[PDB]
Amino acid sequence: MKIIRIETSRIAVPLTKPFKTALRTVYTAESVIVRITYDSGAVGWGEAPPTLVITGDSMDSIESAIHHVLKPALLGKSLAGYEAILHDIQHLLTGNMSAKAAVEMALYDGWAQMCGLPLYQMLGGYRDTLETDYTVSVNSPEEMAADAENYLKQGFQTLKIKVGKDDIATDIARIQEIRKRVGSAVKLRLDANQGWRPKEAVTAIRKMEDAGLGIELVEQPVHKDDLAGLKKVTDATDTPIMADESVFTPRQAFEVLQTRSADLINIKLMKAGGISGAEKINAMAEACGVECMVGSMIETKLGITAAAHFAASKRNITRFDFDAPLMLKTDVFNGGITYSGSTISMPGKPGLGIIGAAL
Amino acid sequence: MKIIRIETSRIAVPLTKPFKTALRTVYTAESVIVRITYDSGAVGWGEAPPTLVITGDSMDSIESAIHHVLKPALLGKSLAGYEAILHDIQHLLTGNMSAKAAVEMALYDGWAQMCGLPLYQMLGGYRDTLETDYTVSVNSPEEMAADAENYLKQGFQTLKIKVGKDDIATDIARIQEIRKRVGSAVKLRLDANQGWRPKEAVTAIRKMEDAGLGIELVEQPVHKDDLAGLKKVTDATDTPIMADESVFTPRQAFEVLQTRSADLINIKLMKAGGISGAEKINAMAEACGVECMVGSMIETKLGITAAAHFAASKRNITRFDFDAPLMLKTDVFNGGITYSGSTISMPGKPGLGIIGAAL
Amino acid sequence: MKIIRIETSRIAVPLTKPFKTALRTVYTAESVIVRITYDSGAVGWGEAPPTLVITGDSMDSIESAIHHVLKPALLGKSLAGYEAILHDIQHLLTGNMSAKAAVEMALYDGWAQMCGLPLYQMLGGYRDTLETDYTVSVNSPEEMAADAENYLKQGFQTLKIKVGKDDIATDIARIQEIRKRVGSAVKLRLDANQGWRPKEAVTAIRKMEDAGLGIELVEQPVHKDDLAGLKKVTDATDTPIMADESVFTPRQAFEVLQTRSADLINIKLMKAGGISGAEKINAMAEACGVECMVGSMIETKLGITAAAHFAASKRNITRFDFDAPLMLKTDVFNGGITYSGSTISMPGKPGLGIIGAAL
Amino acid sequence: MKIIRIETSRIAVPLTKPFKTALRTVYTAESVIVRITYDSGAVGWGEAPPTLVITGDSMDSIESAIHHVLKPALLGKSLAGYEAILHDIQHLLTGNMSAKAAVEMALYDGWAQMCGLPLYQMLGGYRDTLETDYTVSVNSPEEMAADAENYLKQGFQTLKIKVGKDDIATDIARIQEIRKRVGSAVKLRLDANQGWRPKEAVTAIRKMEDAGLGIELVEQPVHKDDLAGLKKVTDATDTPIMADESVFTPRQAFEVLQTRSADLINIKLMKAGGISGAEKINAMAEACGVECMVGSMIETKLGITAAAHFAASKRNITRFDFDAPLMLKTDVFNGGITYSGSTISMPGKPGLGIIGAAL
Ligand SMILES: [Mg+2]
Ligand SMILES: [Mg+2]
Ligand SMILES: [Mg+2]
Ligand SMILES: [Mg+2]
C-alpha cells in the first residue's frame, strides 16, 4: 502492498558537452525525483525532467501536479488495485504527462517489488541486455565528426545524428564528414526533430541514400502535426521513417498506425505518461508489424532504468536510445542498470533496482 | 517458476436445458482441461471446449496442438520470461485459438501464483464483483418468455436474447412476448449470432426502437466477414452494435475500430487465443473510446473464472456474459469464482483459485 | 511602445453558490493576474485560472511559464512588432495555453492602448453591447428549477443548463422541472460537458425535442476526442450542436469544420492561448457558415473583459457566456465591462478599460 | 475617423517591354485609383487594374461597383467599426474582387493612419525588408535567358519563370538555357498559369527533377477549377506546387488545404477582395502548416505597397512577388515601399506611406 507517502526533490547536474537538437540546447540536466514509500517500508523511485518545448512540463508544473492532484488520490491505495490508480493518474488531470510518468515509474517499481521480481521480468522479461546508441549533437560538420570518432572510441558502434536545425545542404555535409571519418561499418541513425518539410526531406534522404551514406532510419523529419507529410516521406524513400513527436499517447499511436504514416515509433515514458501507455503503444504497433524504439528526454540513470526495464521486457522493441545519463558530469544514482560501453545490462533485484542517491 | 509438465484430460457435463443460438445447439458441455505443473509444485488450470462452427477447434484438434506444438516449447521455460512464451504460443501455429487459450489461462494462473496474488489483481484488480447477464436461448415466443420470467426470479435483471435463427417477424414477436411478461425495467441485450443480412437488421432494429422495446445493444447482427455490412447497421440505427464473431484477434479489433464498423466489442479467451490477446483488444478499444464486454463459449466455471479475472481487472470492460456454468447440471470445479444470483465474486486466493475437480 | 516589466500575483474569491458541471465542482475562484508595464507607463492586464481537468494548467505551471519562458523573450519588445511577440508566446513552449492566454490579454490591452481605442474597436467594433446567459449548475431537478427562477428574476432570459453528470433520464427530468417552473418563453442552452455517449445523446435529445422542451443548442454532448461521435449527434438531431472541449486551437477548429462535426463552436481564450488564436478560430468558422459563442473558465471580470472585447468585435460571434464573475462573492476589479442584468456594455477607455484592483 | 468622400481616377503607364504569360500579354498597365478622404483630412489610397481573363474585372466594372454599391455603404461610417464596413464590402455584391480590394486598401491605409503607425506594423510588423523575385516573361529560349542574365545583374537572385504557353518541349528548353546562362546558385520558381494538363505537368516537372535543374516550386500548373488535377501534380512529384488562380478566397483556400491539393498558396489582394480576405487565407494556411507567397497583378507601386505591407506583417508569409512596378516606364506615385535591387523596404510613415501622384 500500500502507498503511504509520496515525496519529491530536485537534481541539477551539468552536462559535459551541451546537448543540441533542432528544438533546443541543454547545458544542465534538471530533474524532479519522486519517491513512493509503501507500507512494507519498500521505496519506489521516479523521475521527470522539464521539457517545455516537447511536453510543456516545467519543474514547477510537475511538482504541483504530483502534490496537489495525484498525491491525495494515491495515499492509501493498494498495488492490488493498480488499474484504478493508473486510471486516476491519467484522468485526474489532462496533459502533465511528465508528472504522470514520474509517478507511474515509482508505482511499477513497488509493484514488481511486491511481486518479488525485477520490473523488466514482470513485464515479459524478453532480454537481459540491450545495445544503446549515442547522440551526436548538432554542430559544424567538423565538430560532429570528431564527436562521433570519440563515441566510437568509447565502444558505441551505433550513433544517433541530430540534424534539421538550419539548412538541409549543411545536414548532408554533416553526415558525409561523419562517414568519411568513422567508416562505413557503424550504424547511423538520423533525427531531424521536425526540422524539414516533406518534399525537402524526400529529396535530401534520396540524396543521402544515393551517396551510400548508409542511413538506418530517420526520426520525425517533419512537424509533429503534419501526419500526412510524414506519410509522404515514409512512402517516398527506402529509408525507415520513425514517428517521435507525432506519437505521445495510445490515441495518437493508433492514428499513426491506421494511416501508416511511419515504419517505426519512438516511445518515451515522459510522452506516454508512464509505462502503462508505453506498453499500450508497443502492443498496438506490434499488431501492425511496427517495431518501436524506446528513448528518453535528458534524464538521469533513474528514468533510463525505468525505460530500460520496459524496453527490455518487450519483443517488439528492438532499438534503444538510452545515452542521456552518460552525458552528465556525475551519476547521481546508486544501482539501477549498469553500462559496459554500449551494452546496458539489467539488474537482479526486485523492481527498478535503484538503491538510492549516489555519493 | 519453471514449467515441468503439461497434462490434458476431458470432461462432459449435461446441460439442464439445451442452449440454442442462430449457429448451434448444445446438449452437453464437453471440454479439454489443461493442468500445467510448475517446479514449485503449483498447478495452473485451463479450459477449451470444441466450437466447430465458431472457432473450428475440436477436442482432438486442441489436444494435438497442446501436446505436439505448445508443450515442447513450454517445458523448461520460466515465468520470468513470459513475453517469449506468449509469443511462442501465438505464432508456433496459426488459428487454433481455443488451444492457445487453454494453455494461456493455466500460464497466467501459474504466473499469478508465483507472485502470490489472485490473477485479477495481477492484471489490475479494478473490481471484485460484477453482474452477469443470463441468456434466453432461441425457442418459441411463449417458451422464451417463460425462461425470461424465471431468470428474473433467480435475480437476473439483464437478459441476453438469442435471435437470428428463424425470420425477422418471429424475432420481433419474441422480444414483445419477453417485454410484456417481464416489464420495462430489466435490460435486454440481443445477439443475432450473424443471422441477419445488413438490410434485414436495420429494419428489425429500427422497428424495435419505434415500438419502445428498449434494446440496450445488438451483438453481431450480420456475417462475421461482412465488415462493411456490420458498419451499415452501426451507422443506420440508434442502437449500439457489438462486434463478436467479427473480432477474434487484436488485428481484427484494430480494423473494426479504424473503420468504426461497430460501437462495442465482445472479447472471449477462446477467440483471442487467451488473455494476452484479450488484453490487447480491450486496450485498443479503450484507446479508441470504446468499451468491451467479456463473454465466453459454453464452458464450465474454470473457463469463466479465467474470463472473469481478466474482465474484473480492467476499467474499460463494463459488461459481463458468464452464464454458461449455470446452464450445467453439475459444477465440476471446486474453488474459482463464486456465483450468488447474478453476482460473481473474485475470491482472495492466488492464481485462479482452482483447487481441483469435484467429488 | 515597448514591454518593460511583467508581474504576476494571485486572487482567491469564494463562490456564492458552488459551480457544478459533469467535469468538476468549484467552491472558490482562483486565478493568476498578469501585469505588463510598457515604456509609456501604461499597464496591460490579463488572467488565467487553474483548470486541471480541462487545460491541464495549474497556478504554479502558469506563473512559472510566464516568468521563466515568456517574460525574458518579451522584455524590450515593441507592440509595433506584435506578430513576432505572438509567435514567441505560442511557440516558445508547447501547451500552457492558459499561460499563453493571460499574457496575450495584457499584450492586446497594451496594443489597443497604444492605438488609442477600446480593444473591441481595434478588433472590429461590431457591437457595443451583448447578452450573456447564466449557468444553472448540476443539482437535483428542484434546486435547478429554483436557481433558474431566481436567475430569471435577476434579468436573465437565457439559461445554460449543465447536464451530463450522472444518468440521462435524470437530465430530462431536470429540464422538465426547469420548463414547468420558468415557462416556455426563456431560451434554454444545454451543456453536457462530454457526459453522453453518441447514441445515448441522440435518443435523449430527440426525447427533449418531442416533449417540446425548446432547446436552443447542446454543447459538447460527447467526449472531446470522439469527433465522429460528435458528428453523429450533429447529424441525427434537429438541435444545434456546439463543439467546446473538442476545439482549443485554430488547427483543431479546422478539423471540426472540415469534417462538419458541429453547427457551432465555443471559443475561450484559455483554450486558444489568447485572442490571436481565438480570432483565427472565428474567422475560419465564419468562412464555413459556422457561428461561434465566446465563453470563459471560472474567471473574474478581468478575463471576461478581455473575452467580451474580443466577442463584441466580431459579427460571427452571436452568443455569449460571460456569467462567471457574477458567481463570485466579490468583484475584485475596477472598471472593464459593466452589467445591467443580462446586458453587458463595453467601456470607452482605450485598451480593456481595467483601472486596477477594486475598492 | 469617419469616411466622407470616395474618389476614383485612371492611369496608364507604359511597360518598358511586354509582360507575357500563358493567359495574357500586357503592353501597358492601366489602373483605377481610389482615394478615400476622412473627416480628419487624411487620405487613404487603393488600386485595382482590370484583369479580364483572371478576375473578370474591367475599369468600367470596378468604377461602377465602387460608386454604385460600395460608396453608399461606406459614407458616414467610422473605422472604429471596420468589421461591419468590411462585411458590406465583401457581401453587398458578389465577385468584383478587384473593386473590393481597391477600397479595402484605402480603408486599411486610413485605419493605420488613425493609429499613427505604418500599416505593416498595424497588421503585425514581423519584418522590415523582403526579397522580391523578378519574373522572366515567356519568349524564346534565348530571349528568356538574356532577361534572366540581366535581372541577376540588377540584383535579383530569385527568378520566376513563366511557362505553359505553347508546349512542354520548349518550356524545358527555356529552363535549361536559363540554367546555363545564370548558374545553379540562383533560385528558380516556375509559373505555368494553368497551361498544362495534369499528366503533362507531372511529366515536365519530373523531367526537370531528373535533369537536376533545381526547381524550387511550380505555380498553378493546371486549370484553376481543376482541383483534383492540381492534387495529382502535387502528389506525383517531389516539387512543391503552389496554388494561384485556384485560390481567390478563404473558402477556396479552405478546400485546397482540406484536400491537400497544393503545398503552398499564392495570395493576391485583387483575388481576395483586399487585406481582410488575404489575412484570412494566410491564417488558415498557418493552421494547416503551409506557408504562403503574396503577389500582385500588373500593378503600380501603390498596389504593391499595400500588398507588401500585408506580406511584411505576417510570419507565415515567406515568399514575395512584387516585381510589377519595375516593369513600368514611370513610377507615378511618391512614397510607398522602396526598391534596392531585389530588396523591398517598408517606410516609416503612418499607413501606406503614399504621399501622392507623379510630379
Ligand atoms: Mg527523436
Ligand atoms: Mg455473441
Ligand atoms: Mg462548455
Ligand atoms: Mg501565378
Coordinates of C-alpha atoms and ligand atoms in Angstrom, one line a residue, chain A residues 160 162 191 193 219 244-245 266 268, ligand 1:
Chain A
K160 CA 22.3 8.9 -33.5
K162 CA 20.9 15.2 -34.8
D191 CA 16.9 12.5 -36.1
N193 CA 13.4 16.8 -34.8
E219 CA 13.2 10.2 -36.8
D244 CA 8.5 10.5 -32.4
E245 CA 6.9 13.9 -31.6
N266 CA 9.7 6.2 -30.8
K268 CA 9.1 7.7 -24.3
Ligands
MG1 MG 13.7 11.7 -31.7

